[PDB]
Scaffold this active site. Structure first.
Site, mmCIF file in Angstrom:
data_model
loop_
_atom_site.group_PDB
_atom_site.id
_atom_site.type_symbol
_atom_site.label_atom_id
_atom_site.label_comp_id
_atom_site.label_asym_id
_atom_site.label_seq_id
_atom_site.Cartn_x
_atom_site.Cartn_y
_atom_site.Cartn_z
ATOM 1 N N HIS A 116 0.748 -1.265 0.010
ATOM 2 C CA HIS A 116 0.015 -0.185 -0.098
ATOM 3 C C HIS A 116 1.010 1.236 -0.021
ATOM 4 C CE1 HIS A 116 0.537 -0.189 4.416
ATOM 5 N NE2 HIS A 116 0.886 1.133 4.266
ATOM 6 N N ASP A 132 -0.007 -7.733 1.543
ATOM 7 C CA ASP A 132 0.536 -6.387 1.674
ATOM 8 C C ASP A 132 1.888 -6.300 1.583
ATOM 9 O OD1 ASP A 132 0.674 -3.493 1.747
ATOM 10 O OD2 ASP A 132 0.037 -3.396 3.666
ATOM 11 N N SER A 171 4.452 1.971 8.373
ATOM 12 C CA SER A 171 3.959 1.127 7.637
ATOM 13 C C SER A 171 5.018 0.499 6.644
ATOM 14 C CB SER A 171 2.732 1.557 6.689
ATOM 15 O OG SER A 171 1.888 2.047 7.460
HETATM 16 C C1 LIG Z 1 -8.463 -2.816 5.339
HETATM 17 O O1 LIG Z 1 -7.471 -1.316 5.531
HETATM 18 C C2 LIG Z 1 -7.815 -0.856 6.675
HETATM 19 O O2 LIG Z 1 -8.685 -0.933 7.309
HETATM 20 C C3 LIG Z 1 -6.716 0.306 6.591
HETATM 21 C C4 LIG Z 1 -6.817 0.982 8.025
HETATM 22 C C5 LIG Z 1 -5.677 2.175 7.877
HETATM 23 C C6 LIG Z 1 -4.970 2.588 7.069
HETATM 24 N N1 LIG Z 1 -4.189 3.644 7.039
HETATM 25 S S1 LIG Z 1 -4.216 4.681 8.318
HETATM 26 O O3 LIG Z 1 -5.371 5.070 8.826
HETATM 27 O O4 LIG Z 1 -3.039 5.677 7.900
HETATM 28 C C7 LIG Z 1 -3.138 3.882 9.591
HETATM 29 S S2 LIG Z 1 -4.098 3.645 11.127
HETATM 30 C C8 LIG Z 1 -2.766 2.415 11.690
HETATM 31 C C9 LIG Z 1 -2.443 2.003 13.078
HETATM 32 C C10 LIG Z 1 -1.483 1.127 13.349
HETATM 33 C C11 LIG Z 1 -0.682 1.074 12.173
HETATM 34 F F1 LIG Z 1 0.315 0.206 12.760
HETATM 35 C C12 LIG Z 1 -0.714 1.072 10.888
HETATM 36 C C13 LIG Z 1 -1.749 2.128 10.692
HETATM 37 C C14 LIG Z 1 -2.070 2.793 9.562
HETATM 38 C C15 LIG Z 1 -1.336 2.958 8.272
HETATM 39 C C16 LIG Z 1 -5.064 1.803 5.793
HETATM 40 S S3 LIG Z 1 -4.059 2.331 4.445
HETATM 41 C C17 LIG Z 1 -2.545 2.080 4.752
HETATM 42 O O5 LIG Z 1 -4.323 1.229 3.281
HETATM 43 O O6 LIG Z 1 -4.255 3.600 4.274
HETATM 44 C C18 LIG Z 1 -5.862 0.669 5.624
#
Ligand code: A1AO9
Length: 221
Positions: free
Chosen positions: A43, A87, A180
């Site tokens: 992602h 991912d 990430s």
């Molecule tokens: C099915 O996919 C989802 O449910 C989803 C949820 C959030 C999200 N991104 S986030 O909100 O920036 C976020 S919260 C969090 C908390 C803890 C952590 F280790 C990392 C993260 C990240 C990246 C995305 S994403 C990366 O595809 O944009 C997808």
């Protein structure tokens, strides 16, 4: 990284910082597996990606920095852009990094066991230190617990058999935005990749299981 401590400088020489440009900019983690290949989350793909290696402080340029341009983004062929299944992504750097005190390769063992919950592991990155907080100036690391799959039941597309449930729900310690693509390091071996979680950063977070993709990662090795 939320609730962690500063790493010893250059004690994680494989850590990679990704500056991603879309067609808005994104920031991700990653780790150097070979001189010209970085392993990160799928992602994190965008149009332009710049990799910073050998960094402890990410805000001001250091003499140990190595910045390289990504020339190819090899997403896993079955990656799902919304559910984030599979991912994982391989990045080919334009040039080869220099193996120094600050830049090193993360070795992959000959065996990758399907790791069940209960294990204690570490994750590092320069991501946000909390909800609405800016990215960390220096490399942070936190110790996290591999949770029972039932702790991640609130995530709609979570699959215990493809992903790791990481983070004690009764604490704030967790990976977060900007972390990430960083490795989940159990006993010195990267068993997971930071994938996603909740916007309010309440753990657990969801991690890609590396053991499933060892033969696929073996292309680079
Ligand atoms: C099915 O996919 C989802 O449910 C989803 C949820 C959030 C999200 N991104 S986030 O909100 O920036 C976020 S919260 C969090 C908390 C803890 C952590 F280790 C990392 C993260 C990240 C990246 C995305 S994403 C990366 O595809 O944009 C997808």
């Amino acid at each position: 990284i939320i609730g962690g401590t500063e790493s010893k400088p250059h004690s994680r020489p494989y850590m990679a910082y990704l500056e991603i440009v879309t067609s808005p900019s994104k920031f991700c983690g990653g780790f150097l597996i070979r001189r010209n290949f970085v392993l990160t989350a799928a992602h994190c793909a965008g149009r332009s990606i710049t990799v910073t290696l050998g960094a402890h402080n990410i805000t001001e340029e250091e003499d140990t920095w190595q910045k390289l341009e990504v020339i190819k983004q090899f997403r896993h062929p079955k990656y799902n852009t919304s559910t984030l299944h599979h991912d994982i992504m391989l990045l080919k750097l334009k040039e080869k990094a220099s193996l120094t005190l600050a830049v090193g390769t993360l070795p992959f063992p000959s065996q990758f066991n399907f790791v069940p919950p209960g294990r204690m592991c570490r994750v590092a990155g320069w991501g946000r230190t909390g909800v609405l907080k800016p990215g960390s100036d220096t490399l942070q690391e936190v110790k996290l617990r591999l949770m029972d799959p039932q702790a991640c039941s609130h995530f709609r597309d979570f699959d215990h058999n493809l992903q790791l449930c990481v983070g004690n729900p009764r604490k704030t310690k967790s990976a977060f935005k900007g972390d990430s693509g960083g490795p989940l390091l159990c006993a010195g071996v990267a068993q997971g990749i930071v994938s996603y979680g909740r916007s309010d950063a309440k753990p657990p977070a969801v991690f890609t299981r590396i053991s499933h993709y060892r033969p696929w990662i073996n292309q680079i090795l």
